[PDB]
Every structure is written in C-alpha cells, then in structure tokens.
Scaffold this active site. Structure first.
Site, PDB file in Angstrom:
ATOM      1  N   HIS A 137      -8.661   3.375  -3.836  1.00 30.79           N
ATOM      2  CA  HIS A 137      -7.340   2.925  -3.334  1.00 30.79           C
ATOM      3  C   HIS A 137      -6.666   2.029  -4.377  1.00 30.79           C
ATOM      4  CE1 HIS A 137      -4.171   1.612  -0.879  1.00 30.79           C
ATOM      5  NE2 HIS A 137      -4.826   0.827   0.012  1.00 30.79           N
ATOM      6  N   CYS A 154      -0.828   3.222   5.989  1.00 32.97           N
ATOM      7  CA  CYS A 154      -0.637   1.889   6.593  1.00 32.97           C
ATOM      8  C   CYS A 154      -0.345   0.928   5.448  1.00 32.97           C
ATOM      9  CB  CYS A 154      -1.818   1.420   7.431  1.00 32.97           C
ATOM     10  SG  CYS A 154      -3.257   0.920   6.469  1.00 32.97           S
ATOM     11  N   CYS A 196       0.837  -1.229   0.000  1.00 33.44           N
ATOM     12  CA  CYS A 196       0.000   0.000   0.000  1.00 33.44           C
ATOM     13  C   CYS A 196       0.865   1.271   0.000  1.00 33.44           C
ATOM     14  CB  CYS A 196      -0.923  -0.029   1.213  1.00 33.44           C
ATOM     15  SG  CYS A 196      -1.488  -1.707   1.644  1.00 33.44           S
TER      16      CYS A 196
END
Lengths: 393, 394, 392, 393
Positions: free
Chosen positions: B348, B378, B88
């Site tokens: 995302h 995160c 991520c």
C-alpha cells in the site's frame, strides 16, 4: 451555466515570526470557513466538497483540506482534498472547484488556500535509517518544499535574477515598483478598503488573547531612497533585496464556488463570474514569466483584450516579476496591482492565490469596475490566471 | 457527453519497507513510469495538457512532486502539473481530477497517477526553527504525522480500524483467512505472469552495481492462516489487526493517460477502460474503513449499474477488516472481490495505490474479457473514492 | 609504598556497528567491575574511589564513572569521577589512582576506561535557540568531541599525514606494520593468549542472548597486497587508509590500584608495579609524536633505558604512529606491540589505555618478562606512558 | 609541604540566555587563564598541567581543558585534562592538582572549571543508526548529562523534594534562606567585595562589544512575600521553585595550585592553604546530604571542629540543601554563605566549585578570617569539601 464566486473572505496576513507564528495553516482555514458559514447562513449540508491549496504540507497532519472542513464546522459527510501548484495553489483550488461544478461532480464547493511559513518544520532525511558517521543536514522545509527550485536546488530569488537580466529590469525600477506597492497598500488600508474582505482571528497566548484584525507585514514608511541602501539577497551583484520582495507570511482565504443559479437559489450574493482560466508552464529558471502565457489563455477564453481589463492583480513574488508581466503585456501602470501587492501585504504561498481572488471580489464591488484578471507566477515554471467579471447587486 | 477513457495504465513493481526502492524518491518512480509510457505509446509529448499526481507524504520531496514527475519524465517544460492529496485515495483522485478537467474543457489529455515512497518520508522537527529552549523535544515520523495517524485524534489508522472491527464483529480468524487468501491469490496470479503487462521494470544503481527491479517483492506466498494466528495485535492490547492482516509501508508509482475516447483514437492510443461512474464520499474519521460503501453506491448510481452487474470489485485492503466489512455490507460474492489479491500481499504505497488499483483492473479486464469493474479505496480522515469502469473492446 | 595493579580485566572489543552497538559504555564498565569484585572477592567497602576514562561523554548520563561504580554493584558510599585526556583517558584513570594513593587521599581505587563509539549521539547546536531560517547541521559527536582536533576541526588522521611527511613513513611500511599487527594478533588470539584478560558479556536481543566472549574487530586474512589496494581515507594523495588504522570500537577495562602492602593485606595477587609515569604535550598537529617525550619521562622516573624494557605496548592510533615512536626510540621490532595492537583489536578511545595496561599485565605473567612500557599518543598533542614491572 | 592556592580569579556569572549565551565554556576558561598569566607574570614554562572541571562536555570539542590551556596562551608543551564529578567538578580540579603535587607528578598546576548551560547541545541518540519507524526524542544535554539522575532519569530538583520531606524543610524556611542569599549577595556586590575576584570579559556581538564586568543573574528586589507566590517547579505539592534554586548559568574560574615554597620562589602571593580534603558518597536520591560526610572528612584531616570555622561556603544547589547541611552540622546562620550563594549569583555546574574556592580566597583576604570550608553536594550522591586557611600578606 456561469460559475460564480460568493462570500470571499480572508484572515489578515501575518509577518514572519509575527502574530500567527503559533497558529497552524489548517486552523487559519478552519476559522475562515467557520466565519463564512456563520455570515452567509449557508446550510453546511449544501457544501459538496472543500478544496484547499497548501504548499508546505510537512507536519500539518493528514490532509489539510479535511482539517479545514471538519474544524471549520462542516459535517463529517463533506469530502475534502488538498492541492499543490506551489504559489498558484490558492487560485488552483478555485479552478479545481470550477472543473468539479462544470463536470457535474459538485454543485457547491468551498475553495481557498492556507499557509504558515513559521509553522513549516525542519526535515531530517537521515533520521529514519541513520547518518552512520559524519555530520548530516537538517533541511528547512520552507526552502526544500516551498522556495528552492526542485531541479537546481537554487532559491526562486536566485533564478529570478536571470529574469531580471533577460528583461533588463533595473534595480531602480524594482525599488520604484516596491515603494509604490507599499504606498498604494498603506493608503488603501488607511481608507478602510480591506475591512470588508478581512475576518479577525483571536490568538490566545500565555495569559493574553489578541484580536488580529489588520494586515501587519506592510511598511508604510518605505521610500525609493531607503530601498536603494539594501544589499542583494540572492546574488552578490544582484538586484533583488528584502525590500523589493515579500516576506515569509501566514494566512488563509476561502470562498463559495457554484453556478449563478445555485448561488441565487441559496440567497448568496455572487461577487465574480469566472469568464476565463489559463494554466501555462515555462522553463523552471524563468518561472516569473509564467503569468504571460496564462493571462493570454484566460483572456482568450473570456474573449477579452488586455485593454478591456479594468485591473490586473498579478502576485508580487518579486518586484521584477510584476514589472516583467506588466511591461510584456503593455498594461497601464495605474491598472496593475492598483491597491498594492504582496511586497506590502505578504505572500503566504498556498493562500496567496485565494487572497488575490478575495481582494479583486471586494475591489470590483467598491469601484464598480467590470473586468479583472488575477494571475500568479509559480515556482517550477508555471502560471495561473482567472479572468473575472463583477456580478451586480 | 464523449466517453472519458484510461489508456496505457502502467506501474512500477511495489517495493517493501527498507526494500529495493528505499533510496529512490517517489518523484523519480513517477518520472520513470511517465518516461516509459511516452516511449511505448509514442504519444506526441506536446499533446499532454497536464500531469496530475497523487502524493500524501510530500514532506522533503521538493517543490511540487507532479512537476518533477513531468519534467524528469521527459515532458516539455510547457506541460503544467500539480499534486493532489486525498490521503489513501490520492492516486485515484488524480484520475478523477483529470476527468473533471477534460469534461469541463480545461484539458483534452492528462497523464494522471500517483507516487509514494514511505522509506523516503523524513522525520520532522517542529521545535528546530524557533528552538526547544529547555527540556527534551520530539522528532516526528512524517509517515505517521502526515500519512497514517488521524489528524483529529493523532491515533493510528489501525487503532481506529479496531472500532470498525468491533462494530461489524469482524473476528481475528476471519481477518487472517482473508489475508491468507489475498497472499495465495496474489502469488498464483504473479506466478501465472498476470502482472507482467502492467509492470515496468526500474533499474536501481547502488555501490555494488545495478539492480533491475522487475517484480513485486513485498508479498509472502508462503502465508497460511496458521502462521497469521501466531502474530500479536499491532495497535491495541486486545486487538485483532496484526502486521500479517494489514499491508506494509511500501513504495511505487503508477500513471495512465486520461482523454475522450475520440482523442485516444486520434492519437493512436488503445483505450483500456471507460469511466462510467465516480463516487466521492465522507464518513466519521473514526470509521473511515466504511468509506468505500457510500463511494461505491455513488459510482454505481452514476453508471446506472447494480452490485450484481459488476464482474470484479477491487477495494483497497487497507486492513483485512476493511475488505471484509465493505464486501459483506455490499453483498459482493467473495470470488468477485480482490480476485487477484490485494494490498495485504502487494503493498500500500499510499498516494500511488489508487492509480495501482486502476492499472490492475485495466490489465485484468483485458486478460479475462470481463466487462465491468469497480475500484474503491477507504481514506484516512473518513473518506471514500470509487470509479465504475467498463472494458473497451479494443 | 610501591603502587601496584591487580586483577586487570577487559571486555572483548566490539566492531563499529558490531555486537556491543546497543550496550552503553557505562554498562560495559559496570560489567567488568562486577566481574572483578566476584572473582577477587574484594570487600566492596574497601574501594575508596572508582575513576573511569571516557571521551565521548555526550548522552552517557550524569558522571559515567558513578554509573560504572553503582551499576557494577559497589555500595553508594563509594565516590567516583570521570577523566578525559582523550585517547590516554583509560591510562590517565590509573595515573589519577596512583596520585590519590601516593597523596593519601585513597588506599584502593578501581581504575579503567569505557567507550562505545556507536553509542556516541549526534548533536544539534541550533535546537535550543533555533535555526530561524535555512538548513542547519547535526554534528557527529564522535568527530566533534573524539576524533577532530579542537583547534583545526581536521580529523586526527588528516593531521597524522603531516607526521607521515615529517618522518618520511612510506605507505608500504605502514601496510607492512598493519599486516604484522593483524598476523600477530590472530596467532596470539588462536593460541588462547587473550582468554585470561577477557571477561565475556551477555547481550540480550529480540527473544535471544549472545555471549560475546572474543574480540571481533580483527581481520586475520589481512595481507600487504590487500592493504596496498585501499584508498587514502584523509588526504587525496595520503598514505593512511581504513586498513592501516583501527576502527571505531567499543569496550571497557578496569583494575585495582593500591599499595603493594594493601594488595597483600586484602589477598589480591598484584600483576604490575608502576615504576614510572610520563605525561607530555606537543604541537596538536604532531600529536602522534606524543609517546616519545612521555616514554622518556616514564623511563627517567623508573631509572630505565629503552634497552632495559622487554616489551613496548604503544597504541596503534595509526600504523604511522607505531613506526615513528618505535624507530625514534630505536626499539627492536620484535619487542614492539608483540601480540598485535589496535589496528587488529580496535581503539575504543577512552578504554584503550586501560586495555593496554590489562594486555601487558597478562602478557608479562605468561612470558615471565620483567619490564614493560605502555604508551598512547593523544589527540590535541599529548602523550601518556607508564613504566611497569612484573610482580612475582 | 603546605599546598596553596594563588591568584584565584573568575568571570562574572551569566544568566540563562544572558550575556555569555554565545561564548563557549572553553573560551571563558581560556580568558581567565590568559588574565591570570598576564597579572601574575608567572613563567608559562613553570605550568606542569592544566586541570579543568566541565560537566556538559557534549559539543565542546576535544578535551575542554586542553582548549582552555592552549587558547589561554600556554605553550603547547603544557599537558591538560578534563575532570567530571558533576556539581563538584570545579573543586575536584583543585583536589586533582593537590594529589598531583603531593605525589610528585607536578610542581605547579592551573586548576579550575568552566560551564555554559545555553551552549549545551540537544542530542539525537537515534540519528546514527536510525529511528526506523515512529517518533523519536531529541534530548536536552543539560538534563541528560547535567541535571537528571543517571539511575532514575528524574531531575535533581525532584529528588531534592525527598530531602525536603526527610528533614521537614518548610517552604517558608527555603524562601527565607533564598531571600537572605539575594540580600547578602546584593549588599556584598554593592560594597565592592566581588571586584577583586572578577575579571571582565569583552563579548563581541553582531551590533558591537559588551564589556561583561559584573554578575547579572541576581535579583536584589527578592522578598519572602514574592517568593511565597511562586509555583513548585518539580512536584505538584512541592516546595522547590524557580526562586529558591539557582538558574542555568555560565562562567569560569581558575587558580594556581603549588607548594607554598614554589609559590614564594615564583613571586606568587598565596591566598589559601589546603588543610583538609573530603570526598564522600551517599544514596543518589539524597545527594543533597553529600556535603555532611565530605565536610566531616575535610575537618578530620585539618584537625578542626565545626565551631573553629570562620565561614562555610556550601553550594546553594537548592535553598533546601543549604538549610539541611547548615542545621545538620550546627553551623551558625551568620557563618553560612556569608556573602550569599548560587541562588543569587548562579550555578554554572562545572565552574561552581572553582568559583566558591575563588570567593573564599578573596573573602578571607578582606576579613582576615582564618578558617573556611568550601563544600558542594553532587548529583549522583556525592559530596566534596576543602578545609582552607588564610595565608598572610
């Protein structure tokens, strides 16, 4: 000020469908890292980052480097990331480590690379949203993500035939180079020269454990006469064969990267100082030439000339690439891939750059040679080189 | 030390799952941003020393996504490129990688960003090479295997985040309130034209012609707390995380120029942000949503900033639960946290999101004249990345 | 000892990616059989065998016919088997039933066919023992097992271009035949002529039901002008298009086959007597001609000539096949596929033969026509025909 | 008119991953048909139909029976169709032929069955319209279409454990039956008793030619002691093992079916008269019992009693099925699968029924025994039986 490599270690290199065929790349890296920590006694909390090269990431699970770190026994507080500059990825991990230390982001990094070409999955591009009607393809990920050029979709070996044509690299010269790689590797292996750098891996199968302790991909019985009989692998009128190129191999290597001062403080024995780094790019179609500009950049940073270097360790992606780089730079044949190369031991893509750094660390220790260059050509038209100097004691 | 600065941060609009970008490879999205960036800046292509791109789902994208972005983006074949994966955080990692190359003297100017297209992630057949022999065999969704499932547990990121919810006692209602507010903030900012400057349109060719994709499409402006309260838990029977308080499976790309301030000025660029601090942290894989807390503390320590000095925090909304835990743990004012909405609204696109958030903050500080921002994500597997960023006065 | 068809019924025919896309072929057959038993009140213990045609058996599970029988509500004591003569399979099931009754193996058989072309899986020949290295193919089973010739690996449509060339069948004639099939079908449908033969299927979705009650694959607005614009589907300068061929359809049909005496004994209302059966084979490459020798065999058994037959129902595998069979036999155009054919309603391969028998059973009842022939060409170079007479 | 079987012939039966692994089922049937026509000299124009059993039709191409006929050398004017009554399919083809002849649709039929379990493909149900998100399954067609019950999705072997429990069939009895099948088959094979029925097949391979002339799946060294060591294959506390069940085999068999008068007219030598046919069905879960009602139907048609039958040939789907059928009907052990069964030679599903008819044709010729019954249990809960009488000369 000096950035040094300590405790370079590697697995033996597995053959295609060989001893490591059921052992994920990340598990091979975890094993080297665990062994490195056990032998050095390095406090695991002193590791600021794990950087691992890996080219065929498909199906290996989230972030191979983090799996190598955690399964290697490092605390969950140690960050990790995976780098991909194709064939150069294992050397890139060490360049990434150098940049993190020189920029003050890290004090100590475990850097290396992992690859297992058997473990590369097939891909089904049409399975998510459907093929609808008509036959569809399942792609071999090792071709799609590893060996085929992303612009042409042609094999690296097919493109290398244009390098062969440009530099007039004869079939006979390629087979002489390949036979010599096999002979040099077999003699060095028999003399025990690779025992220091290799960590054994125990493989559990059906009702057996097998201790994998020795490189298995090499063919000591190779001759120029035998190689001359092989068919071209990539073009009908070609020169590149199964015998003058490496296989589809598996392995891992890792090492500690830190300042000299940090290594001494922690009771490590530095093996090499990084004196120069070169990263260059060329036409994708002529990627085998990539080491030439990369080596020139690394030598310029080290303030060395070609003739100052005791040994060049240039990845044998093909015999033709070794010959073009050696001959273009005017390197003495006795100083080029001195103990043999990937044609003999194998090319586990994302690990190979870390394997070559590991080889040179142990070879300079044994010979007391002072100066080495490690370089790899890179699919897509790149080159990576490190100028390396032996650290005494 | 010379200041390291971000210039010409740009992004594609973000595609919905099975949306406008479903047939456009991640590498093609990055190539388009890089081409547009070179056209608008007039940057001499020979002055690009490296292209670094984040990409998490590399399966089937072909050899070295970053090199495809560079070459298909129109850069000379002499420009080197490599792909980074910190899941991520990959799109922010590319900018940290660039910073480290410049500070260490390996590079003077880097084009850094990230790309992702979750529709384009293939299925994997582990048993096809050497055979299944007898008995049924699995085809794995690479999005789950390499992108969203923890590598140690094989459980979804959303399943693990229910343990973060339990630990920090994050109610369903708090998550839905946060998610509704993300959608409302994003819709208002979008309608006000606040994202026009950072977005480059992409022309998509289909059977029935051309589509000019110019605007984020994944957001739901009509979202309410009442609507979100209707949804079923997505990851555990008695869970709190739903499709409505988490982002989708999105596609997009972002890229920017990283250089010394002096290099930017020399080449006629207009720096947007100075990198004042970088934090990279790791935690238990099972509690990866907490990762931004140590990462932000590291970045603030390097910048010599306190939480109360920061005009806005831009923390990736991996889940509403992660936004709430990070905001409340650090004592950040709700009005200063994801001010113009976040990933629950816009999406995302994993490997691009870090570069998208840096891009968002570059343009938001220019508009508001705010001085100081922190971008943080995160990271699946238990990591966190943060950059402390200061507006450049232009 | 006349063998008769009673209670012929069919599902509506689904379009490719249409209403039946998630409903297995065996479930479609089970539904027709359950409905047939409910409406006739036939004692289930009087069913000696279930015979079902099915061409794309891949992934349908063990013995489609047995699933149709058991899931259709018949006792586990009723045996069942699946037959495959490709496009002729649904008519073959009725011929199989006839043979079992005439030979004394059975007294009463439920015979029909099922197909769902959406539900045909992809095949991975290399997955068992491995591809080892290099890209590998996943085969569309509907091409491999259903539509491509087994000898040439060419599509049935590609081979039919050689039938077009041999019989000099113009593009314009094919498009006129196709437009006429659509127009005839749409008018007959709107007039309610297919209501009696169709049993509705309830399809369960999301939190919803769809009652599928009417054929959906037809295009009532089809014109010769529109069809002339379409590109050839199988050869670059070909004549066969998506508009002068049927789609990739789903459906089921089933009927009771018994002696006339058995039907009367069990309170059934026979619809047709089987007066003649023809099964013929030709060159795989010219399979579209198959109905001609098969029809001649069936007419010979019935002691009929072409001019004695009130209607021919010949499967529209392609408009070109309909024209070649019609014109070779000299059949009057107004007596050939009178209410339209597969170009309009669809060709759910293994069910189509049972669907055509069902159509003719209900059309003769409505019109009081006496004599009909059902025939289908068959991939691989075969033909099947039944000569059928209305029962009062 | 008597309906008779003439010129019954079969391939040797291949083991799973054995000699026939790369030879399609249709090619095996074509080979038997070609050999049958060559040896009999039967006028090809006198063949009215070819009927072939085949269970795993997935990937075998359009209409296996038509491929067997055309590739077997028959004129394109000969019609053909494929029948599927699972394990009974090869016997069903002969029943289909009988019905066509008795009903006047045919005068002469070539009937048999084919199967190759290695050649069964994997299936991807979700590839046409997509899996969208989440892992998806690739199904082994031999389980989905061949061996798993269509109602439960449980293996046939799993269901047969309920037959074992119902009839209290001990593990020891199953292993005794299996050992005896192996011993009987090996002795009969060594005596040359299968030479007459077997036609050799030449398999062309990368490295050259294999003449496949002899059944390869049997284990002559099998003992009760060895079988007692094996683990249950289907349930943890089960009795069915790899050793008391057949393998996953490949093969083909075919024969001429006609009136006696037609056979004599065309210079054929009839081997068997079909005196009775039985087709029955039972609970899917107790499918192993299917032969009992089917055999009673066939004996009733023939007007025979069990004790009038010289030999029963009942397919050994599992040792448990053989024991239940034998003991339920009170058949003498010495008259049940006299020369061994599928535990030894293999169970190539769609061919097995045709293989058992072929075996009995040749065994009655050798022994001069008068009366035989061939029967198979059938997945999904069915049974098929034929009562057969030797024809003299």
């Amino acid at each position: 000020d000096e950035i040094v490599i300590s405790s370079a270690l590697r697995t033996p290199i597995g053959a295609f469908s060989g001893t490591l065929k059921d052992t994920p790349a990340a598990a091979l890296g975890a094993h080297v890292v665990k062994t490195l920590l056990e032998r050095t006694g390095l406090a695991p909390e002193r590791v600021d980052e794990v950087v691992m090269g890996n080219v065929l990431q498909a199906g290996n699970g989230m972030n191979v480097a983090r799996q190598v770190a955690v399964n290697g026994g490092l605390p969950v507080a140690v960050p990790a990331h995976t780098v991909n500059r194709v064939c150069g990825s294992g050397a890139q991990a060490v360049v990434t480590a150098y940049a993190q230390i020189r920029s003050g982001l890290s004090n100590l990094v475990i850097a290396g690379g992992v690859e297992n070409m058997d473990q590369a999955p097939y891909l089904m591009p049409s399975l998510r949203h459907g093929a609808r009607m008509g036959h569809t393809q399942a792609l071999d990920a090792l071709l799609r993500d590893g060996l085929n050029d992303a612009f042409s979709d042609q094999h690296s070996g097919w493109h290398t035939e244009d390098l062969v044509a440009k530099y007039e690299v004869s079939r006979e010269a390629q087979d002489r180079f390949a036979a010599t790689s096999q002979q040099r590797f077999a003699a060095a292996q028999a003399a025990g020269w690779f025992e220091g750098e290799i960590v054994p891996v125990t493989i559990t199968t059906r009702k057996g454990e097998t201790v994998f302790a020795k490189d298995e991909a090499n063919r000591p019985d190779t001759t120029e006469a035998g190689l001359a009989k092989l068919r071209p692998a990539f073009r009908k009128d070609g020169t590149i064969t199964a015998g003058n190129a490496p296989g589809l191999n598996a392995g891992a290597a890792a090492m500690i990267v830190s300042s000299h001062a940090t290594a001494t403080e922690l009771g490590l024995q530095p093996q090499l100082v990084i004196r120069g780094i070169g990263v260059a790019a060329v036409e994708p179609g002529l990627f085998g030439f990539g080491p030439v500009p990369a080596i020139k950049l690394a030598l310029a940073q080290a303030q060395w000339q070609v003739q100052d270097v005791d040994r060049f360790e240039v990845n044998e992606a093909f015999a033709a690439v070794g010959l073009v780089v050696r001959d273009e730079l005017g390197i003495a044949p006795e100083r080029f891939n001195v103990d043999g190369g990937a044609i003999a031991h194998g090319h586990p893509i994302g690990a190979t750059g870390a394997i070559l750094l590991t080889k040179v660390a142990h070879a300079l220790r044994r010979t007391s040679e002072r100066r080495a260059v490690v370089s790899l050509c890179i699919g897509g038209g790149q080159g990576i080189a490190l100028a390396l100097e032996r650290v005494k004691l």
